[PDB]
Amino acid sequence: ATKAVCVLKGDGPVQGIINFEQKESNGPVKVWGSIKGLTEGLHGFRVQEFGDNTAGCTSAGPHFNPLSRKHGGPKDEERHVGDLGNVTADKDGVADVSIEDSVISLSGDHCIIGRTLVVHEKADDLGKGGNEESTKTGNAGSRLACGVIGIAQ
Amino acid sequence: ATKAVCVLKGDGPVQGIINFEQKESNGPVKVWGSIKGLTEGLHGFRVQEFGDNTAGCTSAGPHFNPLSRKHGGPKDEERHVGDLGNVTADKDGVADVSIEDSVISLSGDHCIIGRTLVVHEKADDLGKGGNEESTKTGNAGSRLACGVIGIAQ
Ligand SMILES: [Ca+2]
Ligand SMILES: [Ca+2]
Ligand SMILES: [Zn+2]
Ligand SMILES: [Zn+2]
């Protein structure tokens, strides 16, 4: 039963706190929390490879992709491990995040502890945009906030 | 071979970047970087158990102590895993950190990835203060800046 947590911050209004819980080894990870300061609608939501915030959100590298796959949605067979799809901000600009994923883990090879969680300007198009950026990252625009994923109590 | 990185930030002027490098598993970890905005003199420098920054540096818990020992200096056998002693700020407030430690690790059970690095207001008394706080935290005063230790390239 591991827990993790992440504080999302950036150079703008976007901030949040995201919790991670995995009841057993290689079981589903429940990810939930709250991000505010967002425009209403869909925002790309993913784990980047490195927990390096030295140059803001730009230093965290590619989507966490240890199996060298293409970008997709979380429900797609073809996806990066880091690919957590979208979160949805209500009219008030708050996304009440609640996701369950079995590809990410809080331990082992797919472990995301010490890596970067990031939220984006626009929707992750899940690889369906018909351009190169879609294929690579889902074309979700700017990084708005990020943080390193830490061990929680 | 493993690398890690930490951005230290707080509510005041204290900020820095600390790098970690372990050439071989369970071998010595090289820790180096720079911290600025500090008062001249010694400052406590340690790894706290949790990579939890939700309520600032207070939510990271006690010093990382998987072997259930008392607080010490890094050179002592009686020490917490997270006990990295003091760093030294010059007259300009800049601490050029360079530590080598073989008790902390970037893998296995003494692994510090996903935990919090913190720098303090005052010197760590290294367990020689003759009170209960001394053998708990080393009486290093307020936490001035912290960050979660992340995986680096
Ligand atoms: Ca799994
Ligand atoms: Ca060791
Ligand atoms: Zn991706
Ligand atoms: Zn200690």
Curated annotation (Swiss-Prot), chains A, B:
Which UniProt keyword terms apply here? Acetylation, Amyotrophic lateral sclerosis, Antioxidant, Copper, Cytoplasm, Disease variant, Disulfide bond, Lipoprotein, Metal-binding, Neurodegeneration, Nucleus, Oxidoreductase, Palmitate, Phosphoprotein, Ubl conjugation, Zinc
Effect of mutating residue 97 to M? In ALS1; increases tendency to form fibrillar aggregates
List positions binding Cu cation: 46, 48, 63, 120
Residues bearing N6-acetyllysine are 122, 136
The record gives the effect of mutating residue 90 to A as:
In ALS1; does not seem to be linked with a decrease in activity
UniProt-reported outcome of changing residue 83 to A: Loss of zinc binding and enhanced tendency to form aggregates
1-(tryptophan-3-yl)-tryptophan (Trp-Trp) (interchain with W-33) crosslink site(s): 32
**Effect in UniProt of substituting residue 93 to R:** In ALS1; 30% of wild-type activity
Q: Which residues carry this modification: N6-succinyllysine?
A: 3, 9, 91, 122, 136
Q: How is it modified after translation?
A: The ditryptophan cross-link at Trp-32 is responsible for the non-disulfide-linked homodimerization. Such modification might only occur in extreme conditions and additional experimental evidence is required.
- Changing residue 85 to R does what? In ALS1; ubiquitinated by RNF19A; interferes with zinc-binding; ubiquitinated by MARCHF5; leading to the degradation of mitochondrial SOD1
Q: Which cofactor does it need?
A: Cu cation; Zn(2+)
Swiss-Prot/TrEMBL GO biological process terms = action potential initiation; anterograde axonal transport; apoptotic process; auditory receptor cell stereocilium organization; cellular response to ATP; cellular response to cadmium ion; cellular response to potassium ion; determination of adult lifespan
Q: What is its EC number?
A: 1.15.1.1
Q: Which residues carry this modification: N-acetylalanine?
A: 1
This protein's GO cellular component annotations are: axon cytoplasm; cytoplasm; cytoplasmic vesicle; cytosol; dendrite cytoplasm; dense core granule; extracellular exosome; extracellular region
Q: What is the effect of changing residue 93 to A?
A: In ALS1; increases tendency to form fibrillar aggregates; ubiquitinated by RNF19A; ubiquitinated by MARCHF5
Q: Which disease is it linked to?
A: Amyotrophic lateral sclerosis 1: A neurodegenerative disorder affecting upper motor neurons in the brain and lower motor neurons in the brain stem and spinal cord, resulting in fatal paralysis. Sensory abnormalities are absent. The pathologic hallmarks of the disease include pallor of the corticospinal tract due to loss of motor neurons, presence of ubiquitin-positive inclusions within surviving motor neurons, and deposition of pathologic aggregates. The etiology of amyotrophic lateral sclerosis is likely to be multifactorial, involving both genetic and environmental factors.
Return the similarity comment.
Belongs to the Cu-Zn superoxide dismutase family.
Q: What does this protein do?
A: Destroys radicals which are normally produced within the cells and which are toxic to biological systems.
PANTHER family with a match to the protein in the record: SUPEROXIDE DISMUTASE CU-ZN -RELATED (PTHR10003)
Protein name, entry field: Superoxide dismutase [Cu-Zn]
